[PDB]
Amino acid sequence: MEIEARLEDVRQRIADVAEKSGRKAADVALVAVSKTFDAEAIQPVIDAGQRVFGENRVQEAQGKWPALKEKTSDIELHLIGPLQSNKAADAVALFDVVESIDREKIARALSEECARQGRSLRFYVQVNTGLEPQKAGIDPRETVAFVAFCRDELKLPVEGLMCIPPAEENPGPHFALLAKLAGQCGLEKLSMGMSGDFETAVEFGATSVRVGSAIFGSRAENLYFQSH
Ligand SMILES: [Pr+3]
Numbered sequence: 563m564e565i566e567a568r569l570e571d572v573r574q575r576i577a578d579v580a581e582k583s584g585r586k587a588a589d590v591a592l593v594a595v596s597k598t599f600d601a602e603a604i605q606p607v608i609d610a611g612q613r614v615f616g617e618n619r620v621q622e623a624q625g626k627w628p629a630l631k632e633k634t635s636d637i638e639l640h641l642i643g644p645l646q647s648n649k650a651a652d653a654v655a656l657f658d659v660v661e662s663i664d665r666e667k668i669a670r671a672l673s674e675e676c677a678r679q680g681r682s683l684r685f686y687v688q689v690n691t692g693l694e695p696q697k698a699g700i701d702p703r704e705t706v707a708f709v710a711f712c713r714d715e716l717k718l719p720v721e722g723l724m725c726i727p728p729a730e731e732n733p734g735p736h737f738a739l740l741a742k743l744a745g746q747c748g749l750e751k752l753s754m755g756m757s758g759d760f761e762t763a764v765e766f767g768a769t770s771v772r773v774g775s776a777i778f779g780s781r782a783e784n785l786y787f788q789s790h
Contacts, residue, residue: 564779564787565606569594572776579761590764593640595756595774601626603784607777608634616661616772618643620653627656642724642753642772644698647671654679661686661724661753663712664698673716686724686753687712689743691736694728702739709747722751722769733759737766 577587593616596604604615604626613636617623620641631637640659650671653660663669663685676682687709690699700708705723712718723744727736737754744752744767753770755763760771778784 565777566610568777568779569607569610569612572773575761576764576771579764583765585764589769591770593642593753593770593772594777595642595772596778597622597643597774598781599778599784601630603778603788604630606788608637612777614638614640616640616642620645620649620656623656624652645672650675651679654681654683657683659684659686659721662688662698663718663720664688664690664700666708666711669712669716669718673712673718676718682719684721685712685718686722686751687720688724688726689740691725691739692728692731697726697728699725702743705743706746709749720747720749722749722753723747724753726756727754727759733762734766737763737768741767 573592576590576592580587580590591614593614594607594612595616597618617639627639638658640661641653641657642661644664645653645662645668647667654672654675660672660683663672688699689702689705690697691702693701709720712720723740725736725740727733740752740754751769752767755768755771757773757775760773763771779787
């Protein structure tokens, strides 16, 4: 019963900040990040009512989600980690949403595979909001132009923008910049806010937050839970 309690608390926390910010809890999607957790640990979350999940790696996802999806028909799986061009095919075959379009090469790859597989997924363009040399993502200054490229030239539908700000600084400006860019791109969806800042993210307009440990517990905790 720990999972149900944790999930309800997360949803309640989302609702509290949403309402405080003048928004509806319904406006914020909760993506349960299941990275590092096996199918056995994930099922309890699905049983608790969760349908939207996120995985950082295609390979890890391939090993556990197929069985989970044939068991539960309405799963919405998001790829929230970097994608190598040689895994694009596998990703298009398994995921419903790919939030990591961080460069031209992968946008093209995703575009061709959707075509080759007769599929139409949902996509987010990842922005390197702080322009950190060590981080992936489109330059904020080239984002508007990049989204036009995806939508017009690659005929790749783009749902919104996504970011993962540097952990050692205030998320505020990063979220605010992403919101601004989204408006300039004519996009209404924003994937920002993770484990330690999803509440602040909602305050800046986040429409989708990625929460992992708060739902599953840490690796140690979760396994402790699944003893009885
Ligand atoms: Pr309850």
